[model samples]
Target chain A: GPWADIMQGPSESFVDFANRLIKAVEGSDLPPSARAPVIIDCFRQKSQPDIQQLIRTAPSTLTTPGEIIKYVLDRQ
Target chain B: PWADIMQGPSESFVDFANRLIKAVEGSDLPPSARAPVIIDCFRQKSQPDIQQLIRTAPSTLTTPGEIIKYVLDRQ
Candidate 1:
């Protein structure tokens, strides 16, 4: 329910939220923390429709923010 | 200066839109003056695209509010 208000927007997106989450996840492990930032920046400019398509296609088990990063990274 | 602010490197389209929306909200300009400024800001970005849209669908881009959102949505 925490994201309920955000999801209520007619054109809401998870892209920006996912951007911050991935940065926090792998920032410590990357060489000078670069890999995740690359991923984060990729999603920052995405629009609501882009986010909707990503979520619609994600696996049903993608229940956490980290899962978003994992899904994209795996496909890369 | 208006287009300068809208295309500032520091903010995204949503931020630009909110600032413009609030500004038009606070101005003492007449409704007639207010709408034109917003419409002009939009036209500044892609005049040809907007002109084409206006030519093609004046019904959709019929008002300043409609035009601003339509431009940002495509930008």
Candidate 2:
């Protein structure tokens, strides 16, 4: 539900957007299993090509929201 | 499958457990089979003590919510 409007803010760092996305879904009925994917989808939808490529090619090792956030932040 | 689920490296035990519970809940397995499957899939390296605590718990952890409460109360 929150996914519809949880756009990454202009000038927002990946860290900030990721945190905001997490907060948006924290109390909602979204399953924990779906949360990371939703966050990733939201991030990928608004991210630049380079960042989107990184997400696309990101290894399965980065499975958690926190891990994904770190991966993007480290590279950004 | 619930069996394939593992704790994400950056995920907290609580978070991982919640995911495991949700996955198991959504599976085709009967209600009676869910808790053990959730426990089995939990990352052993993440928090072995919690696992142990669950096993040695005063009462059988029949539900995922109970297991979550059991872990939360200890923490």
- DockQ for every model comes to 0.01, 0.03
Report the C-alpha lDDT of model 2 over A1-76, residue by residue, as the tens digit: 6544776666766677777777886655665555554555455555555566666445444546687678877886
lDDT score, candidate 2, position A70: 80
What lDDT score goes with residue A24 in model 1?
A: 45
- The segments of candidate 2 whose C-alpha lies over 4 angstroms from its true place after superposition are B2-75
- Chain B TM-score against the true chain B, candidate 2: 0.62
Candidate 2 chain B lDDT trough over 10 residues, lowest sum: B37-46
lDDT per residue (tens digit) for residues B1-75 in model 2: 765676665778788877777877898765534543554354132355555555444333434566577777874
What are the lDDT figures for the candidates, one per model?
0.44, 0.59
Error of 1 at B38 (Å): 0.9
TM-score of chain A of 2: 0.75
Which sections of candidate 1 miss by over 4 Å?
Answer: A1-76, B1-4, B45-60
lDDT of 1 by residue, A1-76 (tens): 1211122133443545565445543443333223322332233223244453443345433434466556655653
Tens-place lDDT per residue, model 1, B6-67, is: 43465565566677766765765434334445544543333344434433333324355676
For every candidate structure, what is the RMSD over all alpha carbons to the true structure, in angstroms? 17.1, 14.4
